[PDB]
Nucleic acid binder design. Structure first.
Ligand SMILES: [Ca+2]
Ligand SMILES: [Ca+2]
Ligand SMILES: [Ca+2]
Ligand SMILES: [Ca+2]
Ligand SMILES: [Ca+2]
Ligand SMILES: [Ca+2]
Lengths: 150, 146, 150, 146
DNA sequence: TCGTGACATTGTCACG
DNA sequence: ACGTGACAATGTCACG
DNA sequence: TCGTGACATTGTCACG
DNA sequence: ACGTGACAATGTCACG
């Protein structure tokens, strides 16, 4: 259980979630007849500032087929809300070319590491360790001295 | 370089106005609520009919929004025709801010694209293994002779 | 307890031990007066074939100062009598030069091994293992091939 | 090459006869017990006097024994003058029959003395270590470079 | 006591 | 007739 | 339920 | 005026 969830803000989250889905053409309520449907959506609107009210509206009006989706959306908001306090916990999306993504995904599977982790590997193994041509030479130089004339 | 099928495009254009309106934005370039709403109310009826949409746009849409709508719509075209073939389509990936930085900075330097750089990191490293699987095998033949 | 000691032969051993020491000028008996001394030695002589008799003669006449020495001599006879059945158990004495003995004794101390064992070491380490000049060469021959051009 | 001090030597000679007699040997070159014993009885009285011993020997000692006495006495001289200095004295050592053989055969081959051979075995081997403490140190410097 | 290894003493032989 | 190496047989002693 | 990582969709910007 | 890379913000889903 990483994050503290205070209903006041979480509640406000769903309120906006609901109101938004409604504006995008979705049956927020669980009422089969349009009459009561619009009669419930109108009450949801005037619940803007009241947090205790929303949770109730959900219990007696929200479309049950929204439940899981709303939870999953609220879980994202929580994590993102907290992970936003600092930058190192913040995520950044980088949409790159297919063929490229694929070649990068393969490694993530042939190493079992995370994408964001595999990207770090390539940054180190290549940028930090660059002296394997000379090592091949010098090592023979030293061996030559002991294994031959001195 | 993409074909802009005004029929489909006029669609996107419609939704954008609607959507923006339904979000509380100024779809009109007026002041009062009278002629304002009337514009919208009329735009709503342009559902199936495209040729009439543009008509409304040119005579009502807020100049402010017009700027954005252009980019937005222009953006849809690219993505639209891109998803017509999987290899021409880009996929989004997430990175830990720190991980993103190391990569971003690295690319901004070489001047190449994020995707470009990534491709580089893969080869630069798998080229190094050419040595790891090199000096390691030699040292193994060395101890074996003893 | 390695060897079986049957009084009959052991007894005969001491009988000869005693009789011998007497002939070499030693007070076999524990009798202070020569009179009884010769009177005891004469009885010992006629005990030649009788084994049970000897052990008794020892108990009432033998010089106590002979005890330990006789035991130590009899312990040698036992071991030697048995160890004589076969050759590999038989010992062989080799008197060699001082300076030589010394150099050989040193090794026996710097290895904590037995003389007869140290002599075996020298026979093996020198006679059996004679190929350390070529090994120094060939080993470089092989290393040269892998560590250089092939 | 040793000096044979007849005085001391005549001593050894005396004891030998006595001892041999006391062991049941024929100290005389006779047949019957009469003149035989009388010879001995007389020899016993030659205790302190040496010059008289030889006298008896030449006229009584068994020819058979005379052969041995010679070697025996001649053997004492060597040992006697040898023990006058520790480095000139030899010390006896025991070996397991098998161990003795390996050494004996080895020497009978090179034609040299047991003591000689032993000296050889020591050097031949400590010369080998010149390599054991050689190739071992090189192989240790070899792995260290890796 | 016991077994054992390291020596020691004495006597022969054989060989050079 | 010798000096000598190699034994064989025997006895002690100090260990463990 | 929860946290999480992998994606996806949409909308802007800025730049060439 | 466009195609485009880079985001930001948001939503889902399948894991464990
Ligand atoms: Ca000891
Ligand atoms: Ca010989
Ligand atoms: Ca023991
Ligand atoms: Ca997953
Ligand atoms: Ca850019
Ligand atoms: Ca988890």
């Amino acid at each position: 259980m990483k994050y503290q969830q205070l209903e006041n803000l979480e509640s406000g989250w769903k309120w906006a979630y609901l109101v938004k889905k409604h504006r995008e053409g979705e049956a927020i309520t669980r009422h089969i007849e349009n009459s009561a449907a619009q009669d419930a959506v109108e009450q949801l609107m005037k619940l803007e500032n009241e947090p205790v009210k929303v949770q109730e509206w959900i219990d007696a009006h929200m479309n049950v087929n929204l439940a899981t989706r709303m939870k999953q959306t609220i879980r994202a908001r929580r994590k993102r809300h907290f992970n936003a306090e600092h930058q190192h916990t913040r995520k950044k999306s980088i949409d790159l070319e297919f063929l490229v993504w694929q070649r990068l995904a393969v490694l993530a599977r042939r190493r079992g590491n995370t994408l964001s982790d595999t990207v770090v590997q390539l940054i180190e193994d290549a940028e930090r360790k660059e002296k394997y041509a000379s090592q091949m030479s010098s090592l023979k130089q030293d061996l030559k001295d002991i294994l031959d004339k001195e």
